[PDB]
Swiss-Prot record:
Induction: By growth at high osmolarity, is regulated by cAMP. This is Periplasmic trehalase. It holds the Pfam family Trehalase. It comes from Escherichia coli (strain K12). Provides the cells with the ability to utilize trehalose at high osmolarity by splitting it into glucose molecules that can subsequently be taken up by the phosphotransferase-mediated uptake system. One of its GO terms (biological process) is cellular hyperosmotic response.
Length: 507
């Protein structure tokens, strides 16, 4: 599958640059009505002719992409009822569609996100599992396994323009989730695809020397092996074409290709975009994702290694189980050395430019707790950092910096709420965990009471309003919000007396 900027070459660039559609993703999802080679030749003939109209040419040659709860419907009921609305089934696609086929139905986030997304799906699957839709969980794992075998990795989503990258790696955790229902059979079944995904993340370690980086692998000067986010292309994102061109244009002191690589790699991080990656929080054109070793990614790699060990052991391959534990142990040592800021007292990303742990506290700092990599003293310090700096009245803040980007204050994102809660639980920090859950759930409920929907991210400074920021508007649905809300709704009420709306009083 060739991404649309390649498939449709100059025409793609021209349509995007013309801003015919208010979202650059719209034309990225256009389906050619005939062979792109024919369309391009026709366009070449017409484009310089007197009276040529690009919009009419597009309308001819492409097909462009195409609810309110009943009175008193509870939050839980609304969520359960929305799953089919968010479910898509594309076993086959029309020719030249940027949508990539998947063997089973899948849940998409909502709104402009009309394809499956990698890390969203984990948190969506937690909700599907909580509500007994294990068939759909199994379908999703199967879909991702298929993507691993077909492409060698899980793309950011099932679009041609996402093949160049992945997203935060949750597939091993998806397999572990499935094994909560199916037992170790699930780990053993999908061991081949977990190993294949690990091969993707680690591709480049062979022949890598200390102080070098290759693709998603970094080897520090002392030999420590860690991963980073990394897209295989260094061109504007087809789905955000004009944005990326404008971002690069705005900073002539950097090569455009480096800015494009870093924009794409921030998309791969899931955190498109954030002060977390930026020298200057007020200028996206200073982002330097590929020079930053992320604490979340490396926590997820540790978990992947641990799960690979567990699956290998279950399968009866002891040499591979031992090897993976050895790898995990090395990873954990790397996290504790290079991804802990001892001056500030929190986990943090590592800076390959300055060769120093970064100073900024972000919600990614809870990931070492979430995966049980953290020392207990450091987990307790993280509980304190969370209470002091990140816990707000409406949930866990993503960062403390209001940059105008969406992965930043004052926005709270469902997945980060859950990672934090679960990480804190893993170290017995139940009070802070419950406050995050209650505060965020109150936000979700309040917003639902007012707007009759769940949304992509929330303003945690108060309750009852969705968040904003970045290059597109707040989206509605919303897969991981719905999934995390269900999980948290179960944590907060007895279950001998389960709640269908978030109560005003803690049981
Ligand atoms: O506006 C274009 C971008 O849209 C997506 N970006 C984001 N979408 C939501 C956030 S940020 C991400 O972490 C999740 O996957 C998301 O909830 C759904 O896609 C996509 O993942 C990125 O790869 C795209 O470049």
């Amino acid at each position: 599958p060739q991404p649309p900027d390649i498939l449709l070459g100059p025409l793609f660039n021209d349509v995007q640059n013309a801003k015919l559609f208010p979202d650059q993703k719209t034309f990225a999802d256009a389906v050619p009505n005939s062979d792109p080679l024919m369309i391009l030749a026709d366009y070449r003939m017409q484009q310089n002719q007197s009276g040529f109209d690009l919009r009419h040419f597009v309308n001819v040659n492409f097909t462009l992409p195409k609810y309110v709860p009943p009175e008193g419907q509870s939050l839980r009921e609304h969520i359960d009822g929305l799953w089919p609305v968010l479910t898509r089934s594309t076993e086959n696609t029309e020719k030249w569609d940027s949508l990539l086929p998947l063997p089973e139905p899948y849940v998409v986030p909502g709104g402009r996100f009309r394809e499956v997304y990698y890390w969203d799906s984990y948190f969506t699957m937690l909700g599907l599992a909580e509500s007994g839709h294990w068939d759909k969980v199994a379908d999703m794992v199967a879909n991702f396994a298929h993507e691993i075998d077909t492409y060698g990795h899980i793309p950011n989503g099932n679009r041609s323009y996402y093949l160049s990258r992945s997203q935060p790696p949750f597939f091993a955790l998806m397999v572990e989730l499935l094994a909560q229902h199916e037992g170790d059979a699930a780990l053993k079944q999908y061991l081949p695809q977990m190993q294949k995904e690990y091969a993707y993340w680690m591709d480049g370690v062979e022949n890598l020397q200390a102080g070098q980086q290759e693709k998603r692998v970094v080897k520090l000067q002392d030999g420590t092996l860690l991963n980073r986010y990394w897209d295989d292309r260094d061109t504007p994102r087809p789905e955000s074409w004009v944005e990326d061109i404008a971002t690069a244009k705005s900073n002539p002191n950097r090569p455009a290709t480096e800015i494009y690589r870093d924009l794409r790699s921030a998309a791969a991080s899931g955190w498109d975009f954030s002060s977390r990656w930026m020298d200057n929080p007020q200028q996206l054109n200073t982002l330097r994702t590929t020079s930053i070793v992320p604490v979340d990614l490396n926590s997820l790699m540790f978990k992947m290694e641990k799960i690979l060990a567990r699956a290998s052991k279950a399968a009866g391959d002891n040499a591979m189980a031992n090897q993976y534990e050895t790898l995990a142990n090395a990873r954990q040592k790397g996290i504790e050395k290079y991804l802990w800021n001892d001056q500030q007292g929190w986990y943090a990303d590592y800076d390959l430019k300055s060769h120093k742990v970064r100073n900024q506290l972000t919600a990614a700092a809870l990931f070492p707790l979430y995966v049980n990599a953290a020392a207990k003293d450091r987990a307790n310090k993280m509980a304190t950092a969370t209470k002091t700096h990140l816990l707000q009245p409406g949930g866990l803040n993503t960062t403390s910096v209001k940059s105008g980007q969406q992965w930043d204050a004052p926005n709270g994102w469902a997945p980060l709420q859950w990672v934090a809660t679960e990480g804190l639980q893993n170290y017995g920090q139940k009070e802070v965990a419950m406050d995050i859950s209650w505060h965020f759930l109150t936000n979700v409920q309040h917003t639902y009471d007012r707007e009759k929907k769940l949304v992509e991210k929330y303003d945690v400074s108060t309750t009852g309003t969705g968040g904003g920021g970045g290059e597109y508007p707040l989206q509605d649905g919303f897969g991981w919000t719905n999934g995390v809300t269900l999980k948290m709704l179960d944590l907060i009420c007895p279950k001998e007396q389960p709640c269908d709306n978030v109560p005003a009083t803690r049981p």
